Design a protein around this ligand. Structure first.
Ligand SMILES: Nc1ncnc2c1ncn2[C@@H]1O[C@H](COP(=O)(O)OP(=O)(O)OP(=O)(O)O)[C@@H](O)[C@H]1O
Ligand SMILES: [Mg+2]
Lengths: 528, 143, 147
């Protein structure tokens, strides 16, 4: 029965009176749907932050309310998958009907499991992006921050990472804090189109929703992910974005009367984000035996990576991916700045062939940038520096990749192997030809049955096996030799070209066949 | 004028496709092909669908038409109207200075003027393709 | 009659197309398919490439001998080898269109005209699969001599 009464409504906070035994985040029910959470309480009064609104309720002074006596727990329903829900569990857009029996109830502020329940990260998470999968690896249970400027493609990177899980067992969860509704609907449509809707949930808190909802949305999403992980499933969580979450917490704290701190954020914003993000990782079989991979997103101002919130988040996550506005302005998508990005798991979060294919390429790229930014007196360049410059320029041409394009893990491994062995350096003068040859190789490996056989034998027999060496020598290398001879004739006499392409036949019928196939839908006279 | 330009572009695409030995099927009744007797000597023909020896590399008209809905609708309407006109007994012009007739039963023939055969032979000997059709404003039929 | 109704016109067109593709020099010979089969089968047992070429040529000659007797051979639901004969006893091998809804009458599988040995059947099956893939991607494969 109702046992509280509203006495004041100030600063978007509700003051209730009535003897009770309040607790932190205790649910106060104002109607059958509208609920709030207790923030502070005397023995006869409480301060409450509302979670949702109703048109007909007309919540004002004197309205009756009930202290349920329980904490803020989110309920789990079978029809969460393929739907957009708010922080209380209401289907804003749903794909299937709901049975009104809750599978579980998960506490929003559930404490992270202790040290002995964890396990080392040893399985990759394929993001579908070549440079991320090869040089900036992301494992299952690893927290990789996506830091960047405004409008540089961070949401696209997260969406690509989740769309890459179309043919896997990983459940995607997308938490949106203060986003646009017409963008959430568009992401829902993208999920429906690529057939990942049945394994994806969206948790939405709009930019004009209640501040408590925007503050508590990531925790509710993490509770859902923990429910899924307790039955031993891999969960990939994308929080977009923690700048809005920090803003919501700052707004709530400043309206509640808390004193400000550095950049006007409250003094415990780091604790907020760290206790939020420490609930993801890899767990041993005795404690669920799953994983929760998190990809938080954060925005910088004018490329200032030394901001308070970006550096607070960098100290929590296991590396970061930085997207450059200068690169994005040049039409380079994804605009990932590899020199400013890092993955702290490293080769321990890769397959053996992928680890071997890209063993020391990131360091080579950093050295290439250092030499490019260096001014010296002797205009003579040593052979080692020439090799570094050529390999860095060749590496720069593997980053480019179209939007929503998922590249297989083995294709990325093969491309990185080709780069590492030195076959792509000869394109240091022509980059469009390099792009064409990379596109042809990707098409061959994706469509032809021999390309899929090559990828399969790469997975099961490894790089060092004789069969894969034969496949590389008879399928891929001849095409590269033919293309290099075609585009650059003088390479027929180059010493290194002769040294590498010695026992390789000049076969280029694959490229010509694909060109014919593409041009076969060609017309002599255009209509437009 | 737009429709006329589009129709001329379609017939020129058919012309360019048939000089390379690729028959074009506009309908189950009329199939555009070419007969070459020697180098420098080719002649366009219209034939019915053979019964026991399928033609070598036949392509639909849809292949040589832009994917835009308006262009496809215009070309589809032109093909349908051409079929109806041939069925009722008209004599329709398909290439420049040629004529398409349907004789008794379902036998179609293409009659080529002197200059049309001249342009065919020029295309096959010297690769002098006809220039792309352009938007021409309608001219007053009288005076 | 129509240009298809006579052997000479159709032969001239076929010869012109074949000569053009040959002068482009973009076609895949039997050696190429033998090497592809050798690479695809290189993880169960190594088979000599010359052996594969000989086996493929004997199989295609068997197909030729079967099609010269007026019996069509189906290699796949997609490709069916048949023959069309005109006057004066002249014949011409063909591949028919729409093999899905108008199949030639009395079709027999390739398995009938192949030795019962497991290795030979596996080799020919792999060759057929590679031929289907090569045609799908857009290659020009040689099946009989000078076709
Ligand atoms: N790989 C890509 N290729 C081409 N276009 C891309 C690619 N990635 C993203 N884009 C486009 O670039 C634009 C900006 O990307 P996006 O909206 O994902 O960035 P953001 O950092 O989330 O931006 P915002 O600050 O608006 O949230 C969009 O129009 C998106 O479609
Ligand atoms: Mg965004």
């Amino acid at each position: 029965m109702k046992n509280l009464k509203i006495t004041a409504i100030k600063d978007n906070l509700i003051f209730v009176e009535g003897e009770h035994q309040f607790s932190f985040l205790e649910i106060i029910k104002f109607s059958d749907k509208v609920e709030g959470v207790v923030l502070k309480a005397n023995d006869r009064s409480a301060i409450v932050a509302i979670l949702n609104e109703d048109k007909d309720l007309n919540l004002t002074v004197g309205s009756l309310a009930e202290a349920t006596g329980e904490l803020y727990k989110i309920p789990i329903y079978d029809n969460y998958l393929g739907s957009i829900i708010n922080v209380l569990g209401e289907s804003l857009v749903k794909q299937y009907e709901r049975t009104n029996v809750a599978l579980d109830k998960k506490y929003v502020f559930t404490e992270a499991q202790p040290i002995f329940t964890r396990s080392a990260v040893n399985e990759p998470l394929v993001t579908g992006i070549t440079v991320v999968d090869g040089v900036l690896p992301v494992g299952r249970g690893q927290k990789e921050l996506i830091i960047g400027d405004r409008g540089t493609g961070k949401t696209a990177i997260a969406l690509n990472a989740m769309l890459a899980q179309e043919n896997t067992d990983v459940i995607n969860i997308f938490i949106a804090i203060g986003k646009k509704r017409d963008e959430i609907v568009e992401i829902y449509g993208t999920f429906k189109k690529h057939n990942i809707l049945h394994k994806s949930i969206i948790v939405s808190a709009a930019s004009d929703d209640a501040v408590a909802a925007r503050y508590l949305a990531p925790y509710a999403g993490m509770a859902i992910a923990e429910f899924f992980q307790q039955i031993g499933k891999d969960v990939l969580v994308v929080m977009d974005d923690l700048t809005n979450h920090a803003d919501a917490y700052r707004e709530l704290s400043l309206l509640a009367g808390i004193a400000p701190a550095r950049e006007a954020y409250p003094g415990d914003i780091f604790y907020v984000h760290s206790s939020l993000l420490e609930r993801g990782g890899k767990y041993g079989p005795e404690f669920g035996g799953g994983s929760i991979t998190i990809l938080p997103i954060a925005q910088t101002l004018a490329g200032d990576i030394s901001g308070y919130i970006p550096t607070n988040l960098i100290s929590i996550t296991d590396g970061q991916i930085y997207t450059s506005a200068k690169l994005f302005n040049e039409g380079t998508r994804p605009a990932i700045d590899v020199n400013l990005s890092v993955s702290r798991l490293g080769s321990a979060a890769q397959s053996k062939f992928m680890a071997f294919a890209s063993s020391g390429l990131k360091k080579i790229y950093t050295e290439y940038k250092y030499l490019k930014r260096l001014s010296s007196f002797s205009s003579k360049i040593s052979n080692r520096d020439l090799e570094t410059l050529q390999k860095g320029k060749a590496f720069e041409s593997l980053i480019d990749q179209a939007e929503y394009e998922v590249i297989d893990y083995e294709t990325s491994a093969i491309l990185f192997l080709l780069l590492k062995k030195g076959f792509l350096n000869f394109y240091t003068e022509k980059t469009e030809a390099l792009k064409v040859i990379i596109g042809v190789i990707k098409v061959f490996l994706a469509k032809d049955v021999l390309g899929r056989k090559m990828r399969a034998i790469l997975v099961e027999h490894g790089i060092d096996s004789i069969v894969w060496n034969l496949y590389l020598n008879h399928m891929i290398l001849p095409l590269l030799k033919y293309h290099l001879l075609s585009e650059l004739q003088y390479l027929a006499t180059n010493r290194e070209f002769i040294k590498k392409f010695k026992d390789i036949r000049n076969d280029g019928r694959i490229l010509l066949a694909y060109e014919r196939k593409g041009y076969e839908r060609g017309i002599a006279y255009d209509y437009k | 004028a737009h429709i006329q330009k589009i129709i001329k572009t379609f017939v020129l695409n058919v012309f360019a496709k048939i000089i390379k030995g690729v028959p074009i099927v506009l309908n189950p009744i009329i199939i555009f092909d070419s007969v070459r007797f020697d180098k420098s000597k080719i002649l366009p023909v219209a034939v019915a669908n053979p019964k026991l020896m399928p033609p070598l590399g036949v392509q639909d008209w849809d292949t040589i038409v832009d994917e835009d809905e308006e262009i496809k609708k215009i070309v589809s309407t032109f093909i349908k109207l051409l079929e109806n006109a041939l069925t009722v007994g008209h004599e329709v012009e398909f290439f420049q200075d040629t004529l398409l007739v349907r004789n008794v039963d379902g036998i179609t023939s293409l009659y080529v003027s002197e200059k049309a055969a001249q342009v065919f032979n020029n295309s096959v000997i010297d690769q002098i393709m006809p220039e792309k059709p352009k938007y021409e404003a309608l001219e007053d039929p009288f005076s | 009659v129509d240009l298809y109704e006579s052997y000479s016109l159709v032969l001239n067109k076929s010869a012109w197309n074949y000569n053009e593709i040959i002068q482009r020099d973009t076609q895949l010979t039997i050696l190429d398919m033998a090497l592809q089969v050798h690479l695809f089968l290189y993880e169960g047992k190594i088979i000599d490439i010359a052996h594969i070429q000989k086996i493929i040529k004997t199989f295609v000659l068997n197909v030729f001998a079967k099609i010269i007797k007026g019996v069509p051979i189906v290699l796949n639901p997609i490709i069916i080898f048949d023959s069309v004969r005109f006057d004066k006893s002249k014949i011409l091998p063909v591949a028919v269109a729409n093999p899905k809804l108008m199949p030639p009458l009395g079709v027999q599988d390739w398995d009938t005209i192949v030795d019962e040995d497991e290795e030979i059947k596996k080799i020919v099956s792999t060759f057929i699969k590679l031929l289907e893939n090569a045609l799908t991607v857009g290659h020009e494969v040689e099946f009989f001599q000078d076709t």
